[PDB]
Amino acid sequence: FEQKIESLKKEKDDQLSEGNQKEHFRQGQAEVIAYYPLQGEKVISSVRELINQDVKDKLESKDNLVFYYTEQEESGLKGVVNRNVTKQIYDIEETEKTSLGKVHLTEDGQPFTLDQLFSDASKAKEQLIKELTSFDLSAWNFDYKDSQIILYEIALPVSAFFDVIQSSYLLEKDAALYQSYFDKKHQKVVALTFNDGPNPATTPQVLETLAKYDIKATFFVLGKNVSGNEDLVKRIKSEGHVVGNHSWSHPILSQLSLDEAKKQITDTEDVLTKVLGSSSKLMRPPYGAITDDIRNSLDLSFIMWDVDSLDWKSKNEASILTEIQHQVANGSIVLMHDIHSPTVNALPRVIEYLKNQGYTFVTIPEMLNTRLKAHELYYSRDE
Ligand SMILES: [Zn+2]
Ligand SMILES: [Zn+2]
Numbered sequence: 001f002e003q004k005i006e007s008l009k010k011e012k013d014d015q016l017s018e019g020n021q022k023e024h025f026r027q028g029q030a031e032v033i034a035y036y037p038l039q040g041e042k043v044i045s046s047v048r049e050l051i052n053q054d055v056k057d058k059l060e061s062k063d064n065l066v067f068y069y070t071e072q073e074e075s076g077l078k079g080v081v082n083r084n085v086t087k088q089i090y091d092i093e094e095t096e097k098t099s100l101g102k103v104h105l106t107e108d109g110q111p112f113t114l115d116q117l118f119s120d121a122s123k124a125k126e127q128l129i130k131e132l133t134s135f136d137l138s139a140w141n142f143d144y145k146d147s148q149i150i151l152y153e154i155a156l157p158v159s160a161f162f163d164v165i166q167s168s169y170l171l172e173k174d175a176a177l178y179q180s181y182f183d184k185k186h187q188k189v190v191a192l193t194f195n196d197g198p199n200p201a202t203t204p205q206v207l208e209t210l211a212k213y214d215i216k217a218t219f220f221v222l223g224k225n226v227s228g229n230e231d232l233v234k235r236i237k238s239e240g241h242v243v244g245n246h247s248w249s250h251p252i253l254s255q256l257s258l259d260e261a262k263k264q265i266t267d268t269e270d271v272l273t274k275v276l277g278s279s280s281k282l283m284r285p286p287y288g289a290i291t292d293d294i295r296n297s298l299d300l301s302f303i304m305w306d307v308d309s310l311d312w313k314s315k316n317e318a319s320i321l322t323e324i325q326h327q328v329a330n331g332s333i334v335l336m337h338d339i340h341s342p343t344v345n346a347l348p349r350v351i352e353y354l355k356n357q358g359y360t361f362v363t364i365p366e367m368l369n370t371r372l373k374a375h376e377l378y379y380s381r382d383e
Contacts (some may be wrong), residue, residue, distance in 0.1 A: 004092060005065060005190065006093075008065060010089060011035070012033065012035075012067055012069075012210075012313055014252055016035045016069050017035075018083075019037060019038055020035035020036060020037055020038060020070075021035070021036050021038060022034070022035055022036075023035075023036060027055060027059055027061070028059075028060075028061025029061045029062055029063045029064075030059055030060065030061060030062060030063075030064050030065075030066055031064070031065050031066070032046060032055065032059070032066045032067075032068070033065070033066070033067050033068075034051050034055075034067070034069070035067075035068065035069040035070070036048045036051065036067040036070075037070050037072070037083060039105075039108060039109030040086065040109075042109065044083065044103075044105065044109045046103050046105070046110075047070055047083045047085070047103055047105075050085060050101050051068045051085060052171070054068070054085075054100065054101070061215065062091070063091075063305075064089050064090055064091055065089075065090040066087065066088065066089050066090075067086075067087070067088045067090075068085060068086070068087050068088075068100075069085075069086055070083045070084060070085050070086065071083070071084050071086070073098075075104055075112075075144060076144040076145050076146075076171065076246070077104075077112075077117070077144055077169040077170070077171065078168065078169050078170065078171050079106060079107055079169070079194075080104055080105065080106065080107075080112045080169065081104070081105050081106075081107060082102050082103065082104055082105070083102065083103045083250055084098060084099045084101075084102050085100045085101040085102065085103075086098050086099075086100060087100040089179065102141075102143070104142075107351065110175075110200050112170060113137075113138040113139075113140075114137050114138060114140045114142050115136075115137040115138045116166070116169075117149075117165065117166055117169055118161070118164045118165060118166055119164055119165065120164040121137050121164050122135055123163075123164045124137065124161060124164045125137045127160065127161055127163070127164060128149075128151075128156070128161070131156045131160050131161075132151065132154060132156070135154050135156065144158075145328055146315065147159070147174055147177065148175065149161070151316065158174060158177075159177060159242060162177075162178055162181045162182075165178065166248065167182075185200075185331075185382065186330055187330065187331075187360075188330055188357070188358050188359045188360060189330065189331060189359065189360050189361075189362045189366075189367060189381065190328055190331075190332050190333075190334060190354055190360070190361055190362070191217075191218060191332070191333045191334065191361070191362050191364050191366075191367045191381075192215070192217040192218070192219045192334050192336065192361060192364065193217060193219070193220060193284075193303075193305065193333055193335060193336065193364065194206065194217060194218070194219045194220070194336050194337065194338035194343075195220045195246055195284065195335065195336070195337050195338075195341045196220075196221075196222060196246065196250070196337050196338070197219055197221050197222070197225060197338045197339060198219070198221055198225055198226070198229045198233055198236065198338075199225070199338060199339040200232060202231070202263060202338055202339055202340065202341065202343070202344050203219075203232060203236070203338050203363050204235075205344045206330045206338045206343075206347060207235060207236065207239055207241075208238070209344070209347045209348055209351070210241070210347075211239060212348075213348070213351045213352075213355070215351060215361035216240050216241050216242070216361065216362070216363050217242075217361070217363070218241065218242040218243075218244055218282070218303075218363050218364040219236050219241055219243050219244065219338065220244040220245065220246035220282075220284040220303070221233065221236075221243060221244070221245070221246055221268075221269030221272070222246050222247060222248065222250055222268070223245070223247065223248035223249070223263045223264075223267055223271050224248050224249045224250075226271045226272070226275060227271075233272075233275050233276065234275060234276065237276050238309045239254075241363065242280050242282070242363040242364055242365055243276060243280060244273060244280055244282035244284055244303065244364070245265060245268045245269060245272060245282065245283040245284070246268070246278070246283075246284050246286065247264045247265060247268060247285070247286050248264045248265075248267045248268050249264065249294075250286045251286065252286065252287055252289045253285050253286065253291075253294060254285075254289040254291045254294070255287055255289070256289055258291075258293050258294060258297065259341075261270060261294050262294060262297050262298060265283055265294075265298055265300070266298070269300075276336065278281065280364075280365060281299065281300050281301060281372075281374075282300065282301055282303050282304045282364055282365075283298070283300040283301070283302050284302070284304065285310045287302075287304065288304055290302060290377075295375045295376075295377070297377050298374075298375070299374045300374065300375075301363055301372045301373065301374065301375075301376055301378060302369070302375075302377045302378065303333065303368075303378050304333070304377060304378060304379045305333045305334065305335040305380075306312050306329070306332050306333055306380040306383065307323075307324070307327045307328055307329075307332045307333065307334045307335065307336060308323070308327075309323050309324060309335055309336045309343075309350075310323050311336050311337055311340070311342060311343045311346070312337050312340075314342070315340065315342045316342055317342050317345045317346035318350070319338075320336075320342060320343065320346040320350065321346055321349050321353065324350050324353065324354065325353060328354060328359070329380075330380075330381075330382030331367070331380045331382050332380055333339075333364070333367070333378075333380050333381070367381050368381065
């Protein structure tokens with residue numbers, strides 16, 4: 001027997017002596033041998049700590065011989081390596097656990113934690129919990145592989161967090177994915193959108209101006225305004241613009257019962273399909289007021305905005321232009337109302353400014369294209 005124990009100890013030294021320092025002790029009835037890894041000539045402190053924690057809490061006082069040791073592996077992130085910890089218990093019966101635990105490390109042996117992966121730890125945790133539920137941050141157990149963050153498991157595409165990722169930690173494949181994401185994010189597109197029409201006294205001039213400047217827009221029209229304006233609605237579509245649904249009569253939809261709010265929307269789908277032959281399946285709630293139940297009841301995408309021109313409030317062409325100059329960003333969806341003269345009058349200067357800054361004007365379907373799904377809310381190209 002004694003010779004058998006000696007052979008186990010000799011085998012482990014033959015396997016593990018190099019690059020490790022060997023600790024030996026008894027705890028209770030257990031004999032323990034731990035191989036702590038060196039980085040250069042120094043014990044990796046956070047690995048020694050993880051082993052010692054297991055010794056305190058989980059090591060049972062049985063007549064056994066217990067070994068701990070580690071192996072270095074790649075982490076899947078640039079400049080980060082992992083130590084996997086194996087625990088083996090001999091009673092000759094034996095049982096081992098590989099990756100009993102794992103620590104992530106800089107190449108020089110210092111702790112790397114999940115929060116360091118992100119430029120914004122607070123937002124990332126928020127994004128992680130969100131994607132997590134759909135399926136301290138530093139203390140989160142994780143792995144990284146095949147372009148996914150693995151939570152302890154739960155595997156989440158890394159692409160979902162590119163908004164808050166520290167991209168310098170990405171290896172080649174992920175860095176090319178991030179580059180593509182960044183280039184798309186910096187594509188200079190804007191969607192002009194107009195609520196509350198058609199209005200026979202102003203919409204025709206808006207159409208003439210959009211045609212002059214060789215751009216398209218998206219018009220969220222009221223069902224009640226379609227009667228008597230059918231040829232105007234057809235003209236909006238004939239000139240290449242997109243027509244969406246702005247309810248029948250402009251109530252606060254979230255303050256109606258579910259079926260009355262749904263019917264405000266489907267009555268408007270009905271009249272638009274009758275006049276145009278088709279629906280874009282885009283719906284913008286009056287006042288931005290909507291509920292989850294209404295959204296989940298209808299096969300439509302709900303289009304909000306991120307830039308309010310304030311045309312409705314300022315009623316002033318110079319103010320409208322200033323708001324556009326200061327607020328418009330890549331991917332913005334701009335709210336205007338094609339029902340009063342300040343907006344009509346301001347439009348040429350707004351378009352000239354944005355084209356002079358290098359923007360492309362897009363329709364909502366052009367902007368959202370792949371992203372558009374039933375029930376969902378959209379505030380901009382990306383949000
Ligand atoms: Zn085994
Ligand atoms: Zn409106």
